[PDB]
Design a binder for this molecule. Sequence first.
Ligand SMILES: [K+]
Ligand SMILES: [K+]
Ligand SMILES: [Mn+2]
Ligand SMILES: [Mn+2]
Lengths: 134, 134
Amino acid sequence: MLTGLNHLTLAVADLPASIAFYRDLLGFRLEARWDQGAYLELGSLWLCLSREPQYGGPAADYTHYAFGIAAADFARFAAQLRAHGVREWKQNRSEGDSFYFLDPDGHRLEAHVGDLRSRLAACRQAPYAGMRFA
Amino acid sequence: MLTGLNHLTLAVADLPASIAFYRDLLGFRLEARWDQGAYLELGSLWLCLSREPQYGGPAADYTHYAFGIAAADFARFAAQLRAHGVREWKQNRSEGDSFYFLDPDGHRLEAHVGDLRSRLAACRQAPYAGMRFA
Ligand SMILES: [K+]
Ligand SMILES: [K+]
Ligand SMILES: [Mn+2]
Ligand SMILES: [Mn+2]
């Protein structure tokens, strides 16, 4: 019986750059750092960074990691990261505000307003092709 | 400004096989499906599967997704997935029981007993190399 998400671990080529990005830019709290990785926390989320020499990042697909944000903070978050030169990988077209940006290795991140139920509710009114609810 | 994890999205080449894996072996509830993906939930975790028929899975690195499990359920889960034929990608060496297994595309998964606090406590008593706390 699984209970939910316990932790997310990301391979990173430049552990100092990745710590700076998650901690200083995104507001994760650094809880431990060692020569081959780091542990950080954001709300309930346990993030691990694993130092991976020569890691070139993932290839191009839709695998991605979305973090929550309050509606009132969305615009200012997106503006902040834009002003800091973060690269975007997707322009939003689905329910709920979303800002889609890359981390230093090219992991695909998202800041999103809404949840599974808000998505399901909007999809019932405006469904994707072949969509079925259960 | 970010609040935690909002959802995880995984690229999948074979959407029926991945739905069956997440739903039936890992106990996710299927909430919606459409011709190019699915939404599932496990506890508070929102999982999306994004259909990408030419996806070949990730390359070998330590990026991975750990789900929680209670101590009393661990052995049964590991035994169940081994009996099904699931492939493992790591043998546990760190604090807390962990079972490390691959999904149908080769995404790296883990079922883990413990949390960040238990990990930090064990690390305070026995640090990893160069380890510093924050
Ligand atoms: K969206
Ligand atoms: K472990
Ligand atoms: Mn998303
Ligand atoms: Mn892990």
